[PDB]
Write a protein that binds this ligand. Sequence first.
Ligand SMILES: [Mg+2]
Ligand SMILES: [Mg+2]
Ligand SMILES: [Mg+2]
Ligand code: NI
Length: 195
Amino acid sequence: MAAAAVSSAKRSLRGELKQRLRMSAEERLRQSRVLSQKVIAHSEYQKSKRISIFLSMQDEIETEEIIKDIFQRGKICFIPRYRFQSNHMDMVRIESPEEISLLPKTSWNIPQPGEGDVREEALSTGGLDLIFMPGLGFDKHGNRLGRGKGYYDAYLKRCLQHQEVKPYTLALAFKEQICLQVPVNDMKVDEVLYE
Ligand SMILES: [Mg+2]
Ligand SMILES: [Mg+2]
Ligand SMILES: [Mg+2]
Ligand code: NI
Protein backbone atom coordinates (compact mmCIF):
# COMPACT_ATOMS: atom_id res chain seq x y z
CA MET A 1 0.00 0.00 0.00
CA ALA A 2 2.71 2.49 0.94
CA ALA A 3 4.84 0.56 -1.55
CA ALA A 4 2.11 1.01 -4.14
CA ALA A 5 2.12 4.81 -3.89
CA VAL A 6 5.91 4.60 -4.23
CA SER A 7 5.67 2.54 -7.43
CA SER A 8 3.08 4.97 -8.76
CA ALA A 9 5.49 7.86 -8.27
CA LYS A 10 8.29 5.92 -9.96
CA ARG A 11 6.02 4.86 -12.82
CA SER A 12 4.82 8.41 -13.44
CA LEU A 13 8.34 9.81 -13.21
CA ARG A 14 9.53 7.16 -15.68
CA GLY A 15 6.91 8.18 -18.21
CA GLU A 16 7.69 11.88 -18.06
CA LEU A 17 11.40 11.07 -18.24
CA LYS A 18 10.98 8.79 -21.25
CA GLN A 19 8.98 11.63 -22.77
CA ARG A 20 11.61 14.31 -22.13
CA LEU A 21 14.09 11.72 -23.43
CA ARG A 22 12.80 10.08 -26.61
CA MET A 23 16.25 14.54 -27.59
CA SER A 24 17.54 14.55 -31.17
CA ALA A 25 20.46 12.22 -31.92
CA GLU A 26 22.96 15.07 -32.35
CA GLU A 27 22.06 16.61 -28.99
CA ARG A 28 22.27 13.13 -27.47
CA LEU A 29 25.80 12.96 -28.91
CA ARG A 30 26.90 16.44 -27.85
CA GLN A 31 26.02 15.84 -24.20
CA SER A 32 27.79 12.47 -24.33
CA ARG A 33 30.92 14.06 -25.80
CA VAL A 34 30.99 16.32 -22.74
CA LEU A 35 30.40 13.67 -20.07
CA SER A 36 33.09 11.56 -21.72
CA GLN A 37 35.68 14.28 -21.16
CA LYS A 38 34.44 14.86 -17.61
CA VAL A 39 34.88 11.12 -17.03
CA ILE A 40 38.36 10.93 -18.55
CA ALA A 41 39.53 13.68 -16.19
CA HIS A 42 37.78 12.19 -13.17
CA SER A 43 39.89 11.11 -10.17
CA GLU A 44 38.02 7.86 -9.61
CA TYR A 45 38.13 6.92 -13.29
CA GLN A 46 41.84 7.72 -13.52
CA LYS A 47 42.64 5.78 -10.34
CA SER A 48 40.42 2.73 -10.93
CA LYS A 49 41.64 -0.42 -12.67
CA ARG A 50 38.77 -2.92 -12.81
CA ILE A 51 35.79 -1.17 -14.38
CA SER A 52 32.17 -2.08 -15.07
CA ILE A 53 30.50 -0.09 -17.86
CA PHE A 54 27.25 -0.44 -19.82
CA LEU A 55 26.46 -0.48 -23.53
CA SER A 56 24.34 2.55 -24.33
CA MET A 57 20.75 2.37 -25.49
CA GLN A 58 19.37 5.39 -27.32
CA ASP A 59 17.88 6.93 -24.17
CA GLU A 60 21.29 6.78 -22.49
CA ILE A 61 24.58 8.63 -22.52
CA GLU A 62 26.86 7.04 -25.14
CA THR A 63 29.78 5.31 -23.44
CA GLU A 64 31.46 4.25 -26.69
CA GLU A 65 34.14 6.90 -26.34
CA ILE A 66 34.72 6.07 -22.68
CA ILE A 67 35.12 2.38 -23.49
CA LYS A 68 37.81 3.20 -26.04
CA ASP A 69 39.76 5.16 -23.41
CA ILE A 70 39.27 2.29 -20.96
CA PHE A 71 41.27 -0.08 -23.15
CA GLN A 72 43.96 2.45 -24.13
CA ARG A 73 44.82 2.67 -20.44
CA GLY A 74 45.16 -1.07 -19.79
CA LYS A 75 42.05 -1.22 -17.60
CA ILE A 76 40.10 -4.45 -17.07
CA CYS A 77 36.77 -3.77 -18.77
CA PHE A 78 33.51 -5.44 -17.69
CA ILE A 79 29.99 -5.26 -19.12
CA PRO A 80 26.64 -6.42 -17.68
CA ARG A 81 25.15 -9.79 -18.52
CA TYR A 82 21.57 -9.89 -17.27
CA ARG A 83 19.03 -12.71 -17.20
CA PHE A 84 15.42 -12.04 -18.19
CA GLN A 85 13.99 -14.68 -15.85
CA SER A 86 14.90 -12.85 -12.66
CA ASN A 87 16.73 -9.75 -11.49
CA HIS A 88 20.16 -11.37 -11.83
CA MET A 89 23.20 -10.06 -13.70
CA ASP A 90 26.97 -10.53 -13.63
CA MET A 91 29.61 -8.17 -14.97
CA VAL A 92 31.51 -10.16 -17.58
CA ARG A 93 34.92 -9.18 -18.94
CA ILE A 94 35.50 -8.08 -22.54
CA GLU A 95 38.95 -8.17 -24.16
CA SER A 96 38.60 -5.49 -26.84
CA PRO A 97 36.07 -2.90 -28.07
CA GLU A 98 35.83 -4.78 -31.37
CA GLU A 99 34.47 -7.76 -29.47
CA ILE A 100 31.35 -5.74 -28.68
CA SER A 101 30.42 -5.78 -32.36
CA LEU A 102 30.40 -9.58 -32.53
CA LEU A 103 28.39 -10.33 -29.39
CA PRO A 104 24.73 -11.43 -29.63
CA LYS A 105 22.00 -9.04 -28.50
CA THR A 106 18.96 -9.27 -26.26
CA SER A 107 15.31 -8.38 -26.83
CA TRP A 108 16.27 -4.82 -25.89
CA ASN A 109 18.86 -5.02 -28.67
CA ILE A 110 21.53 -4.84 -25.98
CA PRO A 111 24.78 -6.72 -26.71
CA GLN A 112 26.02 -9.35 -24.26
CA PRO A 113 27.65 -12.80 -24.20
CA GLY A 114 25.18 -15.65 -24.80
CA GLU A 115 24.67 -18.87 -22.86
CA GLY A 116 27.51 -21.14 -23.95
CA ASP A 117 29.98 -18.28 -23.59
CA VAL A 118 32.06 -18.81 -20.45
CA ARG A 119 33.03 -15.35 -19.24
CA GLU A 120 35.35 -14.11 -16.54
CA GLU A 121 32.93 -12.70 -13.96
CA ALA A 122 34.14 -9.60 -12.11
CA LEU A 123 33.37 -10.92 -8.62
CA SER A 124 35.27 -14.14 -9.36
CA THR A 125 38.54 -12.21 -9.67
CA GLY A 126 38.43 -9.32 -7.20
CA GLY A 127 35.22 -7.37 -7.73
CA LEU A 128 35.14 -3.89 -9.25
CA ASP A 129 36.91 -0.59 -8.53
CA LEU A 130 34.37 1.53 -10.41
CA ILE A 131 30.87 0.84 -11.72
CA PHE A 132 29.37 3.18 -14.33
CA MET A 133 25.69 3.35 -13.49
CA PRO A 134 22.80 3.63 -15.97
CA GLY A 135 19.30 4.80 -15.07
CA LEU A 136 16.23 6.69 -16.24
CA GLY A 137 16.71 9.51 -13.75
CA PHE A 138 18.80 10.79 -10.86
CA ASP A 139 18.46 13.64 -8.39
CA LYS A 140 21.34 15.71 -7.00
CA HIS A 141 20.75 14.07 -3.61
CA GLY A 142 22.21 10.97 -5.28
CA ASN A 143 19.15 8.77 -5.79
CA ARG A 144 18.58 6.62 -8.88
CA LEU A 145 15.54 5.80 -10.98
CA GLY A 146 16.24 2.35 -12.39
CA ARG A 147 14.36 0.62 -15.18
CA GLY A 148 12.32 -1.11 -12.49
CA LYS A 149 13.68 -4.66 -12.58
CA GLY A 150 16.15 -4.18 -9.72
CA TYR A 151 19.24 -5.44 -11.53
CA TYR A 152 21.79 -2.91 -10.26
CA ASP A 153 20.48 -2.57 -6.70
CA ALA A 154 20.81 -6.34 -6.37
CA TYR A 155 24.26 -6.48 -7.93
CA LEU A 156 25.69 -3.70 -5.73
CA LYS A 157 24.64 -5.63 -2.64
CA ARG A 158 26.56 -8.61 -4.03
CA CYS A 159 29.57 -6.33 -4.41
CA LEU A 160 29.35 -5.12 -0.83
CA GLN A 161 29.85 -8.76 0.15
CA HIS A 162 32.76 -9.79 -2.09
CA GLN A 163 34.59 -6.53 -1.59
CA GLU A 164 36.27 -5.05 1.46
CA VAL A 165 35.77 -1.51 0.17
CA LYS A 166 32.63 -0.92 -1.90
CA PRO A 167 32.98 0.11 -5.57
CA TYR A 168 32.69 3.78 -6.50
CA THR A 169 29.39 4.09 -8.40
CA LEU A 170 29.46 6.72 -11.15
CA ALA A 171 26.16 7.74 -12.74
CA LEU A 172 26.27 9.20 -16.24
CA ALA A 173 23.20 11.28 -17.06
CA PHE A 174 21.69 13.82 -19.45
CA LYS A 175 20.76 17.25 -18.10
CA GLU A 176 17.31 15.99 -19.06
CA GLN A 177 17.60 12.92 -16.83
CA ILE A 178 18.18 15.03 -13.70
CA CYS A 179 15.22 15.37 -11.34
CA LEU A 180 14.26 17.46 -8.33
CA GLN A 181 13.38 14.46 -6.19
CA VAL A 182 13.25 10.78 -7.15
CA PRO A 183 10.99 8.36 -5.25
CA VAL A 184 13.10 5.86 -3.30
CA ASN A 185 12.90 2.73 -1.13
CA ASP A 186 17.25 1.33 -2.34
CA MET A 187 20.88 2.28 -3.08
CA LYS A 188 22.33 5.74 -3.79
CA VAL A 189 25.17 6.48 -6.19
CA ASP A 190 28.42 8.11 -5.08
CA GLU A 191 28.18 10.69 -7.88
CA VAL A 192 26.15 11.83 -10.89
CA LEU A 193 27.72 13.54 -13.92
CA TYR A 194 25.96 15.86 -16.36
CA GLU A 195 25.59 19.44 -17.62
MG1 LIG B 1 30.17 -10.42 -11.35
MG1 LIG C 1 11.35 16.44 -11.37
MG1 LIG D 1 15.19 17.88 -1.81
NI1 NI E 1 25.23 -15.34 -13.30
